[PDB]
Structures are given as C-alpha cells and as structure tokens.
Amino acid sequence: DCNTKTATGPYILDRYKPKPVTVSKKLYSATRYTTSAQNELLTAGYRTAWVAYCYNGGLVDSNTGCNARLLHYPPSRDELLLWGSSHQCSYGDICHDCWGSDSYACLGQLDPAKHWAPRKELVRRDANWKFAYHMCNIDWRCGVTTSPVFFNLQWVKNEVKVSTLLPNGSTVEHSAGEPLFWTEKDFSYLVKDNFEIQREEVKISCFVDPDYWKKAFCQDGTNFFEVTSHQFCHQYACYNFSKKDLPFGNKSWTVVTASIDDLHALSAAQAFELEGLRASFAELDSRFRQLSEILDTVISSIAKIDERLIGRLIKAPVSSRFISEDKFLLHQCEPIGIDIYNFSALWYPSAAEVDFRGTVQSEDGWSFVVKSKDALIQTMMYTKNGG
Amino acid sequence: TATGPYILDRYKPKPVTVSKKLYSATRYTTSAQNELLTAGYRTAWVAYCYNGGLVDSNTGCNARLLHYPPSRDELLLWGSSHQCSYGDICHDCWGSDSYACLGQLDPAKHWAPRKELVRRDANWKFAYHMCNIDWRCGVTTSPVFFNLQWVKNEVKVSTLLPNGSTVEHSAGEPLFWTEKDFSYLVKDNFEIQREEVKISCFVDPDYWVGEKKAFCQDGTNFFEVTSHQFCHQYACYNFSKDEDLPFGNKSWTVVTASIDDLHALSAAQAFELEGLRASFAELDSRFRQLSEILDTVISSIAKIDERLIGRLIKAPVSSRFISEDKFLLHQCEPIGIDIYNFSALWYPSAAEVDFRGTVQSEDGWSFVVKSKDALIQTMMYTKNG
Amino acid sequence: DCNTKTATGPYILDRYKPKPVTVSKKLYSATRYTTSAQNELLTAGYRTAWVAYCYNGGLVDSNTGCNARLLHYPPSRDELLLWGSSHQCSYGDICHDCWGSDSYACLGQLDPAKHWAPRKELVRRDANWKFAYHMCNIDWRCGVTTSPVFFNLQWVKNEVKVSTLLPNGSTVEHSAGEPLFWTEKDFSYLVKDNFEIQREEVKISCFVDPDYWVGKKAFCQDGTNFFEVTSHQFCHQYACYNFSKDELDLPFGNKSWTVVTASIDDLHALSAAQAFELEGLRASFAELDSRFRQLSEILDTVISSIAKIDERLIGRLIKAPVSSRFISEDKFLLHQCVVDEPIGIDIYNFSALWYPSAAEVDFRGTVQSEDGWSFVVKSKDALIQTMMYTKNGGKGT
C-alpha cells in the first residue's frame, strides 16, 4: 500500500568537530651566545724521574739497600707552552750505575729540563753491584699532547662562561679569555680558548604544548632542545628568552657511556611513534576516500543541471548528458579574493642531523693521560738490572 | 556524436591494516628505581724475611698479598657506618716482633673511612727475621639500576653484573658473594607492585621483513610485545591469551653504544622525516586540489542560489555573477546525520625516554675498578728507603 | 532583503595555494655488494716466557744479580691456525729454581712449543738462594681466542674490499679471500673471512631533497639499513652500492666511529630532536583536523543548497531510499516508501601517500666491546696481576 509516503525528522547534517589540540608554533626572541670554534685546545704534559740510590756494604750492614722511587716533575705553565709549540718534552740527565763521587746525582737537585725529545720513556734500574760504594741510577720519562676537546657554554650568575669538561664528570667554568692551568702528580694541563663568544639577537622557533604531561621544544639549526627556563644553555650555545642520575653522582652526561640497551629503548619509542603515524596516515587516506565519494555524488547532482560543470572540472571542451544517476556522455555539441577555507600553513618535518660528540674520555687529549699511565705500568713491571 | 558513457572515479587508497588496541594486562613495577650495592674490600701485604747473608739458602723474603674480604655481617656494618676495618700494621718488626707475620691475622682491629697499604719488604737486620705487614680496605654504598624478569611464572628482580651476566632473585632475598679481595651485597629497599592496566598498542598484522608485530606505550616506556609474558626494564607484563654473537650472551646493558650506532639510528630518523615531508607535501596538494574542485562547484550553485556565498563567509550578502568566476555582493531537536564517518586521529607526542648508561659506568661497579687501579699504583715498587 | 542599489566588488573565490615543497621519492638503480655472513673470524694468540738467570756470589762479587725479564714468543701463522682449531696453546719447558748445571736451560734458544693446555699463566720467580751457583727460573704464559667480530665493506680503487675494524680506530682493507695476519709484541692475530661478497642489481627507494641547506640531499632505505647517499659510489656498514650517476672529527683524530663511545649526552641530543619533530607533527595533525572540520562545514552548506533542488541527493549520500524536504535552511524531513564499462574520469589526481614504518636498525656496539678484542686487554690485565710481585718463597738445600 506504499502509495502513501511517511515522513520523519527533522534531520540535520552533522558537521565534523575534532577535539582541539593546543600545541602551537611560537617564534621567540632570544639573545644567543655562540663561539667562533667548537673545540678548546688541551695541552697536557708529564715528566717523572726514576731515582734509585743504593748502598752495598754487604747484608751484615744495616745500611745496605736502596732508596728507589718515582719523583714527579710536572711541567710549569711556561714549560708546557714551549712543549706545546715545539711538540717536544724535556728531561734531566741520565745516570747509569754511577758509583762513588758520581753517585751524588741522586742526592742533589735535579734539573728536569736539560735534554729534549718528542717522547721519552724511562728504564727502571736499581743495580747495587759495587761493594763499599753507593750506586745511583736516574732515568726520565716525559711526553706532551696538544689536542682539541669539546666543551659547553654555561650561564654563571648572569654571564656566559666556557664550561671545560673533565673526564671524571666535573666541569670548570671560566671566561673565554682566561686559560685553565693546573698540575696533578706527573701531569700539567693547559686549556686554551682560541675563540671568542659572539652574541646575536635571533628568532627561535618553538612548539609550546600547554597540555603536557608548560613545555617548549625548540630548534636552532641542527640543535634541538627543550627550553626549561628563560636563561638556558645547550652544548655550545646559551640563550636568554623574553616573553636516572644518582647511580652516576652528579657527573656530566658527557662522561656517562650509553649502552645498546639505551639505544634499543630510544629505538622502540621511535618505532611506536612511526607506527602510530602509519595508522593516522591510513585514517587521513580514508577521509580523502570519503570526501571523493561525497563530492562525486554532489557533482553528479549539480552536473545534471549545469552541463558545463564536468568539462570545467576536467578542463576539457565538453558538455555532458547523463544517461543514468552516475553515467554521462560528453559532447562537443583584478577582483578581490575571498578565502572560505582559512587554512593555516603546515609545518613540515625535515631531517634533524644532530652532531654527536662522544664521551670526554674518548678524546685523544684525555686518553693520552690514560695511555701515559698504562705505559708507566709496562716499563715499571720489573727492574732491568743485574739484581 | 558523443563519447562515453563516463563516470567520476572515486579515490581508492590501498588499505593499510595497522590498528590501535587497548590490551588488558597485569603489570608488575617496583617502588624504587635502584638496588643498593654495598661493596667492600680488604687485603694485607705481608713480607716475612730472613737475613742470614747470601751464603745462607734461607735468606730472602716470603712477601705477598693476602685477601681478607669482609664477611656478610662485616659488610653490613661497613655499609651502615661508612668505614672499613683492618689488622695491625708491622713496620720492620724484627726478632720477637717478627712472628706477627706468622699464623692467623686478625683483619678487624682498627677502623678508617679508607686505608691504602704501603709495600715494604726490608730485611736489613743480619741474623734476624723481619716482618712488614700493612693493610688496604674500602667500602662503597651505591644505587645501581636493575631489570625485572619472568622466571618460570613469577617476576624476579634481575641484578645486572658488569660482565653482562645477571642474577635473578626475589626482591626480598639479598645477593651476597665474595670474589678475591671483594665482598658484594645487593639489597632491594623496595617491593614489587601488582596492578591491572590497559596498554595502548599498535598491532600491524602484515609487517613484512622478508616473511604480527605490536608496539606499545606505557607512560615513558615503549616496547615491542613479543609474547604474553614480557618484561621491559623496570616492569613486567602478562598479556591476555587473545591476539650479537661478538658479545656472547651478554646483557645489552653492558655493551657500549658507538657513535657509528648513533649515526645508523639518526639516518633512520632522517629517512622517515623526509618521507613524512614528502607525504605532507602530497596532503597539501590534495587540499589545493579540493579547493579548486569546490570553488568550481560552488560557483555553479551560487549562480542558482544567490545566498550561498553569503552563508559560506558568514555574511548577510546576496551575490550576482558578472562572469564565470567574478561576482558582486549586495548587502542585507533535529536528528544529526553524519555523512563523513571520520575516526579520531592518533596524535604523536614527545617520547621522553630515560637512559640508564652501561652498568660499568655506575659508581658502585667502577669502585671495584678504581680499587684495582689504586692497588697497581701502590704496588708499583717497594718503599724500602 | 536585499537592498540591491549599491556595493560591492567584483569578488572571486580564492583557491588554496600551498608553498611548494620539492622533496620527491625515487627508485634508484644500483649495484649492491653484500656478504653471506655478518662476522669475520678473529683468531688471536699470545705467548710469553719469564726467564730469570741469576748468580749468587755474595754482595762483594759484582756479578751477583739477575738477568730476569719477559721474552715474547708470539705464535707463527701456522701455530695460530693450529691453536684456533684445537682451542689450545703451546709453551716451552718450565724451570723451578734450577741451579748449577741445570741453569743451562736459561741459555740459548728456547723451544716455545713443547707443552699444550687450553690456557697457561706464568709465575714470576727470580730466586737466587744457592751461594756460589747460578739459578734459573723459566715459566710460560699463553692463550688463544677465536671470536666473531663485525666488519664494514668499503670501496678501494673501484673494488669492494672487506674493512677490518681495529680497536684503535684504524682499519685494514682487504679482499675477502686474503686473510690478515700480523704479529705485535706477545700477540699474533689472524682475521679470516668465511663468506663471499655477492653482487646484485637492485632498486632502492630514496627521498631526494633538492632544497636542503644549512647556511642535493638523498636519504635512502634498503631493508633495515638507512643512509644518506653522499656519492654515487657508496658504502654503509655491510653493504656497498654503485648508483648509476646519470640518474642521481678533530678530537678523535680520524678514528673510525665504530670505536668512539656514545655518551648519554649524545643520546639526549638525538632524543631532543625526535621530541621537537613529534611536537611539530602534533601541531600539523591539529591543522589537518582543522581543515577537515572546515571542509565538512563548507560541504554541509553546499549540500544544503543543492539538496533543496535535488530531493534525492541526501538519500544518495547516506545510501537510503529517501527524498528530503527542507523546512528551514539546515533542517529537513525525510520521506520514505562489451558492453563497455563506463570510462573513469579522475578529477582528484591524488598521488599515493608514502606511509612511515618502524625502523628496526641493528646496533653493533664499539669494537673494543667485542670479546675478541677485549681478550687482548684481559691478557694485559692478567699479566699485570701476575707480575705484581715476585713469588720467591721458600726453599733451600
């Protein structure tokens, strides 16, 4: 009996309304402090004498024996500057089995800067073969390195300092104009800045997200960082803007070694994010599929009234004639803009290209100190005597 | 003369079958991030000599290091007090004093925060024995990170050793062992918590790889689920019944990552970001194309419906076209139907993962290496002057 | 409604015109060279003798004393081969306090291959307790490892070589059939390739970005390996590539990056870059959802205008046999109850999206972390422990 029609409604077409996400792109003004170079110059030099003063009066004599030890003569600051420029180190006179009056060498002052060499290793000797006499052996080791080492910049009470990174995780703040010099046992160290700190007014792009877990993430060239306060530093750069740990002490992270396990952990976060993006790209593709179905239906409706529409859409010189709901034949027979879309420019991702520096202990300058220690152990392992 | 029939093609993307899930699971976590490692060492240098002149075959020295690693009860006391104990020192003790180098030594007669020995083997008293004894000792109490691990069907604490081995135990049972000069105590000042949770994962049913993969997030932890019973660092998971030889079997927590490995990971990131850039450019091109289609479409209907352009710009205007594109403007509870059927987009977000470092980098374990290096330096030569 | 008389225009509907971004996807043809396996075989062996030849003539005699020293006898290549297969090392005769005529063993050439053991550590002894006689002490250490070590491939003068990675950051390039053998102090080393380099013609997906500057870049994927192509002749880890060309650090002193340890600081910096990009993708996704929101508003208003004329349109959009009747601007009622296929016309001309995917990059660790090379350091450390003091107790005729 469906000669009669029924009526329901009224209805309305739903608009699409996504939950808003607040993160947005800011362009922050900042004063940026950077350096004209990315390395400090570490000059490290060492010098040690082995001094063995022995008396041989036979085993009955309680004075028979040896006073044999290492004595450190670390270079002074002036010496180290000359060692660095000449790539050579200096050492004292060698005494080989000196007895009698010649044995005084082991008792008097030692002049540690009488002979030069690029490197010098000592021989450990404590011979005592001359009965009723003292016997003296002296020999020297020395060496020097001049090596570039990376560094950080750092705010220290409202001024930008160079932060020299030490292999034990401590740091020493200083101005780019004041070299560091210190002595420790056999070694002296000179850290020099052959660069200056330049300041610039810059604009930094950041994404501020008030809905963490309030949090700003920024990019400056190949450097990426989370800005946590208005005075901020990252590696070689400090900024002023406008408007896990305790297993390692408070050691700088530049001396803590990453594990493969840490890389796996970072990799799995990447994997999760990329797969989510994959799922979201699938939904975006689905929306364009849906919009093409809606549009094709809408166009089919208007095109039956306006026989030029299809031709204008494909830029073909044809008018159309429909033979069904969807099938059609084709025959060949300056103003003011109004934006109805109001689209905002997309931010595009790009390859990050982060520079990596490695641990401070990996640097040649600092591993030179470890190599010096290892070589002393080898040469000291046993006496080179007739003893 | 006409051609056709034609039909408007619809856009048909190849389907991509990765989907978001909400999995139910039991999650085992712990109060604290760290175990407590107490490590203490103690060694005596003992040099027992006889000087009968070189004609006597008994002239010479029995000089050596002897280890007295602290017992469990001692290590507990060294831990709480931050001091170590050591025995009597003998400096050139001859005659009746030289017998201190014989028999049993009492290694716990004095206390110090730390103590290093001096190596001496003097023998200068003709016709007498001569005895030198000195001691080294030290203690550290250091937090060290751990993993949880399924053993049989229970969740154990996995203590990580610097050589890449691991020891599984309950959180309640401390580890204690002794090795040469050192004794080691691992205590857990925490308990394992049980909680029912829902974990968001993306399951990709066709993942290739030359051939079914699930990637999950739990807060700041991300992992690939590879079984129903699963652990990732400080947490173990039990999921419902739905859904390198160069290093030996070493725990990856002791293997150092190289800069080369970081470059490999960075290059992966760079490729994916550039592909995302290419895809964003295609997405922008599609919105460009849609705005051209819609403008042509609207311009056709707006000639029929002189109010339409007004509704599109929220204005009370009427329109009159003077050409195909150019126009003038004259001034002047329902049931929802959803024709779009859009699904919520998943949004990414900064994934701030915590890094732990190699076991060997931790202060607790490098204390062992530093004690070894310090003994080499003090033993380098005899102090007989 | 309306007062025609005056205003305004003419106006035109703006089209959306995005700034063009010029990174494009390529399939590059290349010759790829890979290997059957991902490890070389490092055989490393050491052997040393402690030899102490002493004379006791009392302290008045200037020849009283010792010639006590370590003497290295690194295995020959043939020895090393036998050590690796047997998993044993050889060493010479040992002498404990051999005095008088037996001290003869400390003189002349020592034969270092008389005994066998899986491993052997020496005792350091230089006793001299036999007055008016010589005394001889000899002992030996030896050890061997056979371990897999990872390697790179590398182009050397237009051929693919295997690149053996040494723990000091240098590398040795050689053909896969040329084993490496060298001797250094107490150690000899044999590096053997039990694999072949295989050639293959491939197509490689790359994204090429001609607008890539800092102050012309190509990023490729091949399986789980990702690399930036910097030249037509190019290697990445275990693979070398030759791309058709008509189609396209001071603190470490030039060491291979495979020996430079990554810091936690380095990881944080990469992590920070990931975070910035992901929050950018978040913001960009928000703009995408905004655009769909906006399109749904435009389409709804457009459909509302056409549907008043075409009462079947809405029924077709929801796939239902209904005609509509508008009762206001937005509100409407619904009333109910060969031969050739059509030629498709594509007005959209969308290109297929590239979809991201989890990258499962393999990590290799530092060379020094490998068991084969850490064996050398352990050998050195063990020698230091054994040599730390002489074990001269305690005998006498």
Ligand SMILES: *[C@@H]1O[C@H](CO)[C@@H](O[C@@H]2O[C@H](CO)[C@@H](O[C@@H]3O[C@H](CO)[C@@H](O)[C@H](O)[C@@H]3O)[C@H](O)[C@H]2NC(C)=O)[C@H](O)[C@H]1NC(C)=O
């Ligand atoms: C970066 O850090 C510096 C401080 O180290 C800030 O620079 C300061 O900028 C203010 C402007 O907001 C300057 O104050 C102005 O001084 C002039 C007279 O010199 C006065 O006429 C203005 O009314 C105002 O008081 C101030 O001199 C300047 N400080 C220094 C030491 O030069 C800056 O705000 C920080 N952040 C940025 C630039 O984003």
Ligand SMILES: *[C@@H]1O[C@H](CO)[C@@H](O[C@@H]2O[C@H](CO)[C@@H](O[C@@H]3O[C@H](CO)[C@@H](O)[C@H](O)[C@@H]3O)[C@H](O)[C@H]2NC(C)=O)[C@H](O)[C@H]1NC(C)=O
């Ligand atoms: C981490 O390492 C740094 C650098 O080695 C340590 O600081 C350094 O400490 C030494 C003492 O061991 C200082 O050398 C000495 O300085 C005094 C004072 O002038 C002098 O009398 C001595 O002759 C000797 O030269 C050295 O100056 C100092 N260096 C710096 C840059 O501060 C630091 O103590 C270590 N931290 C830990 C927790 O081990």
Ligand SMILES: *[C@@H]1O[C@H](CO)[C@@H](O[C@@H]2O[C@H](CO)[C@@H](O)[C@H](O)[C@H]2NC(C)=O)[C@H](O)[C@H]1NC(C)=O
């Ligand atoms: C890795 O290190 C552990 C801990 O030092 C070693 O296990 C110890 O071995 C000593 C000596 O055999 C025992 O006295 C201890 O009881 C062991 N402790 C534990 C917790 O097991 C283990 O053998 C080492 N493995 C390797 C391959 O070096």
Ligand SMILES: *[C@@H]1O[C@H](CO)[C@@H](O[C@@H]2O[C@H](CO)[C@@H](O)[C@H](O)[C@H]2NC(C)=O)[C@H](O)[C@H]1NC(C)=O
């Ligand atoms: C890399 O591939 C190219 C192209 O296949 C090789 O080019 C050959 O050598 C020269 C170009 O330098 C020309 O004769 C031809 O382009 C190629 N010759 C032949 C016979 O095809 C190039 O040799 C390859 N590189 C290596 C190292 O094999």
Ligand SMILES: *[C@@H]1O[C@H](CO)[C@@H](O[C@@H]2O[C@H](CO)[C@@H](O)[C@H](O)[C@H]2NC(C)=O)[C@H](O)[C@H]1NC(C)=O
């Ligand atoms: C890095 O180590 C290699 C191997 O230990 C060094 O080269 C070997 O050592 C000496 C020096 O020339 C030669 O007798 C060997 O034959 C070398 N072998 C090989 C395979 O090269 C090399 O000199 C070291 N490099 C640095 C910069 O220290």
Ligand SMILES: *[C@@H]1O[C@H](CO)[C@@H](O[C@@H]2O[C@H](CO)[C@@H](O)[C@H](O)[C@H]2NC(C)=O)[C@H](O)[C@H]1NC(C)=O
């Ligand atoms: C459909 O889109 C494609 C772009 O994806 C257009 O094809 C070529 O695009 C490249 C851009 O890399 C240009 O260099 C070419 O000039 C374009 N044309 C041709 C013929 O290759 C194509 O023009 C589009 N088709 C329509 C009808 O708009």
Ligand SMILES: *[C@@H]1O[C@H](CO)[C@@H](O)[C@H](O)[C@H]1NC(C)=O
């Ligand atoms: C256009 O977008 C901006 C920001 O997205 C918004 O502030 C503004 O109100 C919008 N204008 C219209 C007419 O929708």
Ligand SMILES: *[C@@H]1O[C@H](CO)[C@@H](O)[C@H](O)[C@H]1NC(C)=O
């Ligand atoms: C883990 O889940 C499985 C499957 O649901 C089941 O054996 C039980 O619920 C859990 N078992 C344990 C030991 O937690």
Ligand SMILES: *[C@@H]1O[C@H](CO)[C@@H](O)[C@H](O)[C@H]1NC(C)=O
């Ligand atoms: C709407 O929801 C999903 C698409 O995400 C689909 O399963 C369902 O059939 C859709 N219904 C429609 C399009 O009417």
